[PDB]
Nucleic acid binder design. Structure first.
Ligand SMILES: Nc1ncnc2c1ncn2[C@H]1C[C@H](O)[C@@H](COP(=O)(O)OP(=O)(O)OP(=O)(O)O)O1
Ligand SMILES: [Ca+2]
Ligand SMILES: [Mg+2]
Length: 430
DNA sequence: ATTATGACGCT
DNA sequence: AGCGTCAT
């Protein structure tokens, strides 16, 4: 009843760029704009691996992870842009720098948590309170929400999508009580107005379009964001949760896309998020552990407490290359050359990071994979990172891994290496 | 023969 | 610490 918390204390948004790497390439090369196009890395093997796909191309069934030669079978006129190559490896600098552009604009509106290269969570709670004071009990015009969907509406008593969007919006605004400044539905609505403004600013100043979700926590904001893409934003109210979750596959919720989600389905014999409400907190804890059990118990009711962490910069800077099939490194000279290439890119990124962000990494992590292992990493060892120098870093990396060489021969490397990975971590202010 | 990342949890 | 999971 009156003591039962409802997880409506915050307004949280998740902003995610539409087909991000593609938009970066389309801004640079107008010939790619408004075309079925994809971004690919490498080229020799099957025309390269697709990593981002424009919405026009998705209509043909082109997807991420598809080989470009295969995508071309679905979409003969597919245009491609290739990821830059430096020191023999894909170099993602252009996209990282474009990411910074967006993150800096968002940070003008509120504190953000960088969640990936192309998305950030936003805690809008305080910004909403402020805007509410400005409004002075003034109603919110639908004009202020020109790209917003209200999940679950319209309902009750309509052919085209934009018209549906507006009907839903009008039902929502018609029911709002703007008299109450602590009304969670009102707070979300004002949050959506701010997110419209943030999204407009992003597009004006970068050229990039994005989608967004607005709700009361990160998981719902994230789910909302994906409900209407591209170039639209979705508000998921506390009230919409029971209907939304009643047919929502468990795997769609962030963190349940893998083995745990699979275990939830298997052990409990259920399919949808809403079916979780029927179990006690202790029951869920017994199957999935104290922490997961509590989290699932609240989450299936639309409640989640993870804070938007104030962190705009990545916590690690890493460089990685796979050496698949026949290209696996089988000589010490090979291993040393590629560690150097990786270390050189890393030094470059580290030096720029130190200048821009006044911090220095203190730990170097070195990871490899050996031919045969089905695991991402076979071995992960750390050493001290005392100087931003590529030759030293690569020499150190070699030293920590050199014992993995089964070969009785000094020159040879066995079993061959199918992945190398250098990662700088444990930053300190400088 | 996706690849190149990046965060966080467990013990 | 080194490993595993989940994600973009
Ligand atoms: N598995 C991956 N491997 C390599 N790069 C990836 C991978 N997943 C995502 N990326 C890169 C390319 C994407 O443009 C960018 C953002 O990813 P993501 O948000 O999942 O999709 P997207 O922005 O391309 O399309 P959407 O409009 O569906 O969000 O990160
Ligand atoms: Ca995206
Ligand atoms: Mg994303």
């Amino acid at each position: 009843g009156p003591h039962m918390a409802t997880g409506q204390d915050r307004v949280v948004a998740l902003v995610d760029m539409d087909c991000f790497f593609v938009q970066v390439e389309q801004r640079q090369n107008p010939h790619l704009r408004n075309k079925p196009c994809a971004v690919v890395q490498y080229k020799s093997w099957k025309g390269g691996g697709i990593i981002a796909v424009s919405y026009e191309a998705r209509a043909f069934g082109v997807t991420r992870s598809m080989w470009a030669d295969d995508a071309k079978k679905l979409c003969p006129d597919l245009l491609l842009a290739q990821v830059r190559e430096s020191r023999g490896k894909a170099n993602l600098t252009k996209y990282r720098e474009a990411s910074v552009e967006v993150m800096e604009i968002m940070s003008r509106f509120a504190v953000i948590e960088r969640a990936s290269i192309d998305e950030a969570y936003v805690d809008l709670t305080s910004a909403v309170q402020e805007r509410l004071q400005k409004l002075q009990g003034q109603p919110i015009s639908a004009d202020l929400l020109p790209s917003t969907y209200i999940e679950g509406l319209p309902q009750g008593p309509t052919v085209q999508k934009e018209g549906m969007r507006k009907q839903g919006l009008f039902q929502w605004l018609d029911s709002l009580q703007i008299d109450n400044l602590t009304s969670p539905d009102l707070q979300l609505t004002v949050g959506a107005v701010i997110v419209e403004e943030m999204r407009a600013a992003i597009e004006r100043e970068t050229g990039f379009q994005c989608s967004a979700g607005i709700s009361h926590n990160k998981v719902l904001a994230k789910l909302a964001c994906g409900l209407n893409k591209p170039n639209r934003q979705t508000l998921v109210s506390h009230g919409s949760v029971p209907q939304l979750f009643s047919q929502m596959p468990i795997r769609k919720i962030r963190s349940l896309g893998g083995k745990l989600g699979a275990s939830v389905i298997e052990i409990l014999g259920i399919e949808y998020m809403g079916e979780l409400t029927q179990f006690t907190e202790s029951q869920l804890q017994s199957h999935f552990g104290e922490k997961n059990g509590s989290w699932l118990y609240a989450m299936c009711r639309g409640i989640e407490h993870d804070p938007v962490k104030p962190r705009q910069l990545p916590k690690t800077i890493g460089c990685s290359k796979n050496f698949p099939g026949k290209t696996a490194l089988a000589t010490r000279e090979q291993v040393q050359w590629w560690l150097l290439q990786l270390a050189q890119e890393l030094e470059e990124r580290l030096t720029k990071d130190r200048n821009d962000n006044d911090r220095v990494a203190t730990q170097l992590v070195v990871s490899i994979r050996v031919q045969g292992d089905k695991r991402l990493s076979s071995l992960r060892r750390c050493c001290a990172l005392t100087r931003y120098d590529a030759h030293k870093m690569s020499h150190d990396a070699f030293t920590v891994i050199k014992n993995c060489n089964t070969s009785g021969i000094q020159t040879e490397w066995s079993p061959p290496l199918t992945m190398l990975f250098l990662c700088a971590t444990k930053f300190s202010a400088s």
